[PDB]
């Protein structure tokens, strides 16, 4: 039902199909055990009212509240999925169980829970963000030298940086505050500013649709991370614990990015309780990286030994030589 | 040898300066690195990098036609018709008449938004009265 | 509406890659230059360099050669440089 | 293995927050890389 609502919104840029996913990302994915029946009932009656209202205006705008043509297919699928979920919740025992006080209590128990099932999903968040970055940079060739994509990639870089910052300090209140800001920012900027300036209708820009979809995926991952909590060990590198060809090659590929490794080291140093200058930090990181690569090569040459100075196999020699030749 | 000596002397002098500095402003032990200097250096590196990579990616008046002219000709002979107009038969569309223009294309399917890019000034009309000005002297 | 009057992408990309390669020098080859940075009490090496300069100023080139040989041998062995740049605490 | 051990201990101590041990271990690592002979003596094959 989450995916069908997100798709209904990606196919229609109205304001009601915009009001609903905000409640999805701020109320559904933040309840502790599971979303309450109140939210499901509200979503059901909201889809009902939307279907009714979109029907009346077939007799007789600038924002694109409705087109008044074609089908209401997506609303039908949305309602059917909501009722399906309600029915299979009632099949189990999950169903059936002035305004500042409830929100205060809710956010308080979310920030200070009785128990926290701590887990780390930060790597998935960063993978979603870097896929979004690949999309936003390859959009240069097709959609918003242009103007809007500049500030778009700028705020993307900024949100990635501040997200890593929030992750290092293992803060939760900061994470929920950042989620609340970022959801409103992204939605308003994507459905009230982008479709107007140097842009056709949003329902025809596929790149923006994929960007929005992966950003909703990132929003869901961040909401999950908030719901569970943060562990106590968030310092070790992501892929330095196997000593294998996969680790070695992925680590080399990670180091091949021009402005990523040193930026990573600086960002780790600036938000970590340490007592070393920046130069000492850089020296330690350099030493650790080289020693790790050497350890990987040592383990490799241990696992696949060669007896003595017989030869170097003609296959690998020819391969490397031809590779260097074709590269040159 | 001269270059080696100068290099050694420069590096040793810089190291001596840093030693004297860390002697004059000591810090007790591994308490912390003050958040102020850490934030300062981090933000400085960040703004330097974004200025290096981003700033290279940084980078109307209405008019009216003074003369209009039309020429119709047959094959490769002298033109049979030629006519020009200037500032008198050039009508700027009256605002009310411009509104009747706007709604005149009501039953049109998808050419109204094409003209909605303009205003009542960048669209004018040119009248060409009757006969041809020049003769026909083949 | 006439507006008043108002390749390089390749050069931009090239200079960005070159600047990235240059920045990498501050992070990939630092462990190599540790024998010449973490030095406490460098007063003796600075003394030797100042004596070299003073002898060169005077014109007694034999002492200049001797002191230059001493400095070269100092930088030609890390262990004697450690033994030579101790903290000298008394 | 020993240098990797030392770096991992540095990282773990930094994670915990006992910065005195961090300073001691960083000094040890700096002195390790500040003399090749003790690095040879410290990275022997350790065959038994």
């Amino acid at each position: 039902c989450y995916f069908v609502i997100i798709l209904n919104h990606m196919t229609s840029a109205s304001i009601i199909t915009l009001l609903l996913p905000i409640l999805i990302f701020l109320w559904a994915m933040l309840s502790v055990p599971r979303p309450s029946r109140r939210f499901w009932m509200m979503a059901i009656v909201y889809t009902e009212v939307a279907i009714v209202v979109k029907y009346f205006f077939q007799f007789g705008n600038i924002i694109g509240v409705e087109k008044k043509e074609g089908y209401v297919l997506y609303d039908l699928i949305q309602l059917l999925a909501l009722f399906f979920h309600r029915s299979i919740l009632k099949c189990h025992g999950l169903w059936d169980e002035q305004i500042y006080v409830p929100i205060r209590q809710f956010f308080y128990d979310l920030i200070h829970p009785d128990y926290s099932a701590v887990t780390d999903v930060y790597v998935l968040m960063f993978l979603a963000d870097t896929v979004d970055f690949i999309i936003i940079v390859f959009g240069f060739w097709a959609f918003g030298v242009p103007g809007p994509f500049l500030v778009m990639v700028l705020i993307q870089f900024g949100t990635m940086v501040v997200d890593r910052a929030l992750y290092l300090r293992k803060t939760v209140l900061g994470k929920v505050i950042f989620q609340v800001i970022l959801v409103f920012g992204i939605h308003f900027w994507m459905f009230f500013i982008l479709p107007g300036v140097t842009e056709r209708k949003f329902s025809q820009n596929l790149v923006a649709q994929l960007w929005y979809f992966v950003k909703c995926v990132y929003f869901g991952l961040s909401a999950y991370q908030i719901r569970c909590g943060y562990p106590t060990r968030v310092l070790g590198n992501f892929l330095t614990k196997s000593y294998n060809y996969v680790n070695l090659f992925l680590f080399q590929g990670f180091r091949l990015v021009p402005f990523l490794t040193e930026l990573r080291a600086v960002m780790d140093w600036v938000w970590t309780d340490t007592t070393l200058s920046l130069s000492s930090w850089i020296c330690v990181e350099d030493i650790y990286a080289h020693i790790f690569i050497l350890k990987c090569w040592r383990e490799s040459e241990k696992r696949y030994p060669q007896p003595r100075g017989q030869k170097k196999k003609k296959a690998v020699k020819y391969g490397m030589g031809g590779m260097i030749i074709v590269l040159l | 040898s001269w270059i080696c000596v100068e290099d050694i002397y420069a590096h040793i002098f810089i190291l001596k300066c840093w030693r004297e500095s860390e002697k004059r402003y000591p810090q007790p032990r591994g308490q912390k690195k003050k958040k102020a200097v850490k934030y300062g250096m981090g933000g400085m590196i960040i703004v330097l990098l974004i200025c290096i990579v981003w700033f290279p990616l940084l980078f109307g008046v209405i008019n009216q036609p003074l003369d209009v002219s039309v020429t119709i000709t047959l094959g490769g002979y002298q033109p049979i018709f030629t006519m020009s107009a200037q500032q008198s038969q050039l009508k700027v569309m009256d605002n009310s008449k411009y509104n009747e223009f706007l709604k005149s294309f009501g039953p049109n399917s998808g050419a109204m938004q094409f003209l909605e890019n303009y205003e009542r000034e960048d669209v004018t009309v040119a009248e060409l009265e009757g006969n041809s000005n020049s003769l026909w002297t083949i | 509406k006439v507006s008043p009057p108002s390749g390089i992408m390749g050069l931009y990309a090239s200079v960005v890659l070159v600047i990235g390669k240059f920045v990498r020098e501050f992070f990939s080859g630092i462990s190599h230059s540790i024998m010449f940075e973490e030095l406490p009490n460098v007063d003796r090496i600075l003394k030797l360099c100042t004596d070299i300069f003073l002898v060169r100023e005077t014109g007694e080139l034999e002492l200049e050669e001797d002191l230059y040989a001493k400095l070269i041998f100092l930088y030609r062995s890390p262990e004697t440089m450690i033994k030579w740049t101790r903290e000298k605490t008394n | 293995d020993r240098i990797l051990k030392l770096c991992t201990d540095i990282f773990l101590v930094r994670e915990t927050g006992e910065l005195e041990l961090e300073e001691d271990l960083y000094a040890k690592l700096i002195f390790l890389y500040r003399s090749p002979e003790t690095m040879i003596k410290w990275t022997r094959e350790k065959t038994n």
Binding site: S280 | - | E38 | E23, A27, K28, I30, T38
Partner: peptide, 20 residues
């Protein structure tokens, strides 16, 4: 002192003990 102790390395750190 911070700067005094951060550079307090010597040979006796790398002894052949390896006390396992």
């Amino acid at each position: 002192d911070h700067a005094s102790m951060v550079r307090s390395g010597d040979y006796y750190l790398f002894e052949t003990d390896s006390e396992e």
